[PDB]
């Protein structure tokens, strides 16, 4: 837990990072650096975007799996990291 | 309608070719330096090359003053009877595989410099005596400004061009030196490249009257020149004859001082970025000489036993400089550590290969070495090569002043 | 036009790039350098994804708009930017 | 009072009860966050005020095909939350 | 409290710390006479 | 001192520093004494006959040159020679006072 | 204002600038004559550049009379001797 | 050049007439669904009235008069090069 | 085609220096000035002819070529009485 939070504070302390949260392979936050209502909306939408990215990987070829996801918009960049049971999603502004 | 998208991915196809390997060299050279006493090593980083300049010599190198990853490379031909076209290429550390901007010239590019206030403007001189001003914002390969016979040019190859502060009418200004002994100030007024002859180089002591009545006065071929850091009018001329002419902008007829520097061609004269009185000279005489502008005699002599192509001061401290030689060896010196020998001497290329130019990145601790076959190699200095001791330029001034005064005390006694 | 096709040839000649497809907003490819059936399922499946990626981002922020999308699978990263009425896909292997 | 502009797309009534739909949806959005209760509050207020049977759809991404009586249907955007109110019964 | 939360954060956080710097060091939005009439 | 007599002139109504001159050799000399003082900025061979009259339009863009043959040439000067530069009057005010002094 | 400050330092000095004692001729006149000749070659350089800027016979002679009473000094006479012959050469060109 | 330029006058005039007459019946469908009564997107060339004259329905003015007057316009367009004197060609096509 | 009499004089200007004259010759300067003057007279011939063709013949031919003989309105549909102006008035005025 101490090493877990040490990396996760380091991720937040990196340049341009707006907020970091962990959503599972189901759609619920675990820890967050934002408020509860904003994170839950971030958790349900981006996880369902993550498995849709995972779906886009497997119908291209079933032997392939998604390992990393960047979503750049007009304002920020959403950075999804898929694992077996967790998604490490980080909001970062590259312009900052 | 895909112009915006294709420009985004062109810049940013170069992500995993940058930051899988840019953070690599941040902590890749932390090895075996706690066991080595005072000898550093040059760490082999990436190699930059293009197919359009395989048979051309790298003749000028200059980092971008704004970007820590972008640098401009010029290609020429030092072989006098193998002259050819000249390439102007810009490489980014983001894209080691492909250069960011390609430019071409009819004559061999032998000098370039990037404006510090305007990193998108590069002034490039050639073998035919033309100086050209390329704009990086324009995607076209043509220079924005270019000298010619009608607009004023050199009749001899241009060997160094250096950007300068704007003139009395707030127009961009840069100076050029060439083998015709003419130091010309080039001014960027509207859409013209106006030329002003500042100093005409002449050789003293060899004005001999041929016995029918004509005096072809000897014209000293100019090779290298750099401006003083603080004094605006102060600059030096490194000549073909092995002489250094201390000169001023306001004195077009009289040199302020003359140093008998070397005995073959002085390739590079540069001022110390911290100490205002220290400049250095290298030549094909195999000796590397350090000088004070108030003293005729050279403070240090370093015989490298191979023709020193280029030298460059490091901007992190005033007592360390680098030298590259035609035998393929890169020499690193530190006066505070070794007043007589190189702290590092590693062959970065082959014996057949002749090194031409060398420069340092401004922030990242990585150097670039040019070549006579167009090769570019990146090399990170070891922590032994960037060892740090209060901070400030006056600290570096006082550090070199103690080294100056000690060698002054050497020459007073010895 | 000339700069657009030069960039397309430059992107195809980039190291590790396996794919370049120009698709409109419906899923129909326009310009492609490869075989059609791999091109078509590349066009159609992520047009379903870009309708989900843009909706998820705009669900988060009404005034935001999707500018870029990275789908890093185990073999490569699906590297693609929408542009007005079109989106241009670059299939680049970063290890190649 | 949030400054969510009522962007009316299709409002098939008179103008008076269009504002009642806007004001009640403003109250429903201020009082509730779950789209269940926002659609519930608009419908239960309209059932009490303008007789059974009303149906309200509240959400951010939905494509709706419903059949509604004349002079008894609105579809509008209040800020970003979309409200589909129609009478059928 | 499950152990699979620990190694997933270490594996993906190594990807995050490597790739956030990839967003930081590279800016994506960085956009580089008188004739006779 | 030119090799030919000077026959007409007209100031630029939009540029205080620009005046135009004519010769008997059909040469229209465009002068601008911030760029070059002792030499004209642009020299034009308008015709092979003697110019006699010269007029400039009020916007400073169009120039009419009349010759000895009763012909008139309409010339559109460059935007650099027909547009007021920033504080060009202030440049002219300083050196006119300096040269008067 | 910079010129006002340096003269204020001389005016505000505790020791008078008009301090006259023994052997003071060799103390400062050798430094004073050095500054006169340095200003002479600086003014001579100004006159030479202005002589090249002189566009005619009468204006060069007016400029010759502007910089008069100093060209009799041998060093600036050597500097201006060539430009007198240049004035000779374009008097020919005006006669032609 | 003068025949070619004059042919460009007639060919641009005749194309402009031909393009204007060639207008679709429903060419105002882009505005609204009731385009039968409203004026078209490109304005209709002619306006007529429909009335009954037992046992026939006669449109006024006559449609045959529209074709004849358009042909008379074409004839006077054809009559335009008759009034233009020609220079520097002996024979183009005037028999043998 | 039309300047071969004068180009023969230009051909009369160049030939003594190409074949008969040598570098040791002392009449080079007379040949230099004779060639320069005849080239200078050729410069005066070229610029006047270029002005009278690039603009004068071409633009007036272009100006009359761009004239539309039928000023087609878009504010009022043409009728039987309206189209008579197109047939008679502006058709004759365009012909003039």
Curated annotation (Swiss-Prot), chain A:
One GO BP annotation of this record: microtubule-based movement
Residue(s) carrying N-acetylalanine: 2
Gene3D superfamilies found in the cross-reference section: Dynein light chain 2a, cytoplasmic
Cellular localisation: Cytoplasm, Cytoskeleton
InterPro entries: DYNLRB1/2, Roadblock/LAMTOR2_dom
GO CC term, one of those recorded: centrosome
Keywords noted in UniProt: Acetylation, Cytoplasm, Cytoskeleton, Dynein, Microtubule, Motor protein, Transport
Tissue: High expression in heart, brain, placenta, skeletal muscle, prostate and small intestine; moderate in kidney, pancreas, spleen, testis, ovary and colon; low in lung, liver, thymus and leukocyte.
GO molecular function, one term: dynein intermediate chain binding
Keyword Cytoplasm: yes
Top-rank lineage group of the source organism: Eukaryota
Role this protein plays: Acts as one of several non-catalytic accessory components of the cytoplasmic dynein 1 complex that are thought to be involved in linking dynein to cargos and to adapter proteins that regulate dynein function. Cytoplasmic dynein 1 acts as a motor for the intracellular retrograde motility of vesicles and organelles along microtubules.
Remaining remarks: Expression is significantly down-regulated in hepatocellular carcinoma (HCC) patients.
Family classification: Belongs to the GAMAD family.
Protein name: Dynein light chain roadblock-type 2
Organism: Homo sapiens (Human)
UniProtKB/Swiss-Prot annotation, chain F:
Tissues expressing this chain: Highly expressed in trachea and testis. Expressed in respiratory ciliated cells (at protein level).
Residue ranges the record marks as coiled coil: none
Subcellular location: Cytoplasm, Cytoskeleton, Cilium axoneme; Dynein axonemal particle
Entry superkingdom: Eukaryota
Per-repeat ranges for WD: 1-33, 39-77
Family recorded in the similarity comment: Belongs to the dynein intermediate chain family.
Implicated disorder: Ciliary dyskinesia, primary, 9: A disorder characterized by abnormalities of motile cilia. Respiratory infections leading to chronic inflammation and bronchiectasis are recurrent, due to defects in the respiratory cilia; reduced fertility is often observed in male patients due to abnormalities of sperm tails. Half of the patients exhibit randomization of left-right body asymmetry and situs inversus, due to dysfunction of monocilia at the embryonic node. Primary ciliary dyskinesia associated with situs inversus is referred to as Kartagener syndrome.
Job description of the protein: Part of the dynein complex of respiratory cilia.
Record text on subunit structure and interactions: Consists of at least two heavy chains and a number of intermediate and light chains. Interacts with DNAAF2. Interacts with DNAAF6/PIH1D3. Interacts with HEATR2; probably involved in outer arm dynein assembly. Interacts with CFAP53.
Name the UniProt record assigns to this protein: Dynein axonemal intermediate chain 2
Part of the whole protein covered: 405 to 505 of 605
Curated annotation (Swiss-Prot), chain G:
Family: Belongs to the dynein heavy chain family.
Annotated localization: Cytoplasm, Cytoskeleton, Cilium axoneme
Disease annotated for this entry: Ciliary dyskinesia, primary, 40: A form of primary ciliary dyskinesia, a disorder characterized by abnormalities of motile cilia. Respiratory infections leading to chronic inflammation and bronchiectasis are recurrent, due to defects in the respiratory cilia. Some patients exhibit randomization of left-right body asymmetry and situs inversus. Primary ciliary dyskinesia associated with situs inversus is referred to as Kartagener syndrome. CILD40 inheritance is autosomal recessive.
Organism: Homo sapiens (Human)
Top-level taxonomic group: Eukaryota
Domain notes: Dynein heavy chains probably consist of an N-terminal stem (which binds cargo and interacts with other dynein components), and the head or motor domain. The motor contains six tandemly-linked AAA domains in the head, which form a ring. A stalk-like structure (formed by two of the coiled coil domains) protrudes between AAA 4 and AAA 5 and terminates in a microtubule-binding site. A seventh domain may also contribute to this ring; it is not clear whether the N-terminus or the C-terminus forms this extra domain.
Subunit note: Consists of at least two heavy chains and a number of intermediate and light chains. Interacts with ODAD1.
Name of the molecule in the record: Dynein axonemal heavy chain 9
Coiled-coil portions: 21-46
Curated annotation (Swiss-Prot), chain I:
Cell compartments where the protein resides: Cytoplasm, Cytoskeleton, Cilium axoneme
Coiled coil: 1-54
Tissue/organ expression: Expressed in airway epithelial cells (at protein level). Not detected in spermatozoa (at protein level).
Superkingdom of the organism of origin: Eukaryota
Disorder this protein is connected to according to its UniProt record: Ciliary dyskinesia, primary, 3: A disorder characterized by abnormalities of motile cilia. Respiratory infections leading to chronic inflammation and bronchiectasis are recurrent, due to defects in the respiratory cilia; reduced fertility is often observed in male patients due to abnormalities of sperm tails. Half of the patients exhibit randomization of left-right body asymmetry and situs inversus, due to dysfunction of monocilia at the embryonic node. Primary ciliary dyskinesia associated with situs inversus is referred to as Kartagener syndrome.
Family: Belongs to the dynein heavy chain family.
Role description: Force generating protein of respiratory cilia. Produces force towards the minus ends of microtubules. Dynein has ATPase activity; the force-producing power stroke is thought to occur on release of ADP. Required for structural and functional integrity of the cilia of ependymal cells lining the brain ventricles.
Assembly: Interacts with DNAL1. Consists of at least two heavy chains and a number of intermediate and light chains.
Protein name: Dynein axonemal heavy chain 5
